From Swiss-Prot:
The lineage of its organism: Eukaryota, Metazoa, Ecdysozoa, Arthropoda, Chelicerata. PROSITE patterns: SHORT_SCORPION_CHLORIDE. The presence of a 'disulfide through disulfide knot' structurally defines this protein as a knottin. Pfam families: Toxin_5. This is Chlorotoxin. Belongs to the short scorpion toxin superfamily. Chloride channel inhibitor family.
Length: 37
């Protein structure tokens, strides 16, 4: 399912997840998975 992981130890996890999902507000970190909205 995931575009990429979300690791809480990576304080930039939300910006990375957005990058994976195509830009601002497009990705959500839900537990350990970045999911494209």
């Amino acid at each position: 399912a995931m575009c990429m992981p979300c690791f809480t130890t990576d304080h930039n996890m939300a910006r990375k997840c957005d990058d994976c999902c195509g830009g601002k507000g497009r990705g959500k970190c839900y537990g350990p998975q970045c999911l494209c909205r």
